């Protein structure tokens, strides 16, 4: 297996491009979900009241800002666009965002399902 470092090189989003904000949004969200998965698995059995209440708060604010941002941004870019490159980027953008969205939702549900103090 090849495990290499992956850090956003283009942080400065001055241009504030549509795809730029979208990619950054889906990237951050996805990452958080991947890392959150672990806590969810451990919390599933641990059933820790503190760990749960915490994950819920973090997952709430994350899924919230992501849902709102993604929805708005997506609705913005969806306004008008037609091109090979634009189509490709747009396709992958919605693909990654959609995936992270489903996973995130599932995680939240599970957390809420687990009974704790």
Q: Could you tell me if residue 9 is inside a domain?
A: no
- Per the domain annotation, does 79 fall within a domain? yes
Residue 67, exposed/middle/buried by CB under 10 A (0-12, 13-18, 19+)? middle
Interatomic CA distance for residues 104 and 2, integer angstroms: 26
Which domain CATH number covers 106?
Answer: 1.20.58.970
Q: Which two tokens mark 17?
A: 């491009």
Experimental method: NMR
Distance CA(37)–CA(26), nearest Å, equals 16
Q: Does residue 12 form part of some domain? A: no
Measured between alpha carbons, how far is residue 82 from residues 15, 62, 86, 99 in Å?
Answer: 20, 31, 6, 23
Judged by DSSP in three states, 86 sits in: helix
Domain contains 98: yes
For residue 74, the enclosing domain spans 17-117
Q: Based on C-alpha coordinates, what's the Rg of the chain? A: 17
In a domain, 109, yes or no: yes
- How many domains are there within the chain? 1
């Amino acid at each position: 297996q090849e495990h290499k470092p992956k850090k956003d090189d283009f942080r400065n989003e001055f241009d504030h491009l549509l795809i730029e904000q979208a990619n950054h949004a889906i990237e951050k969200g996805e990452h958080q979900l991947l890392y959150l998965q672990h806590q969810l698995d451990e919390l599933n059995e641990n059933k820790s009241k503190e760990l749960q209440e915490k994950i819920i708060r973090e997952l709430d604010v994350v899924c919230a800002m992501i849902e709102g941002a993604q929805g708005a941004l997506e609705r913005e870019l969806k306004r008008t666009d037609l091109n090979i490159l634009e189509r490709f980027n747009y396709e992958e953008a919605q693909t990654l965002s959609k995936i992270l969205l489903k996973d995130l939702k599932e995680t939240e549900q599970k957390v809420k399902d687990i009974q704790t103090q």
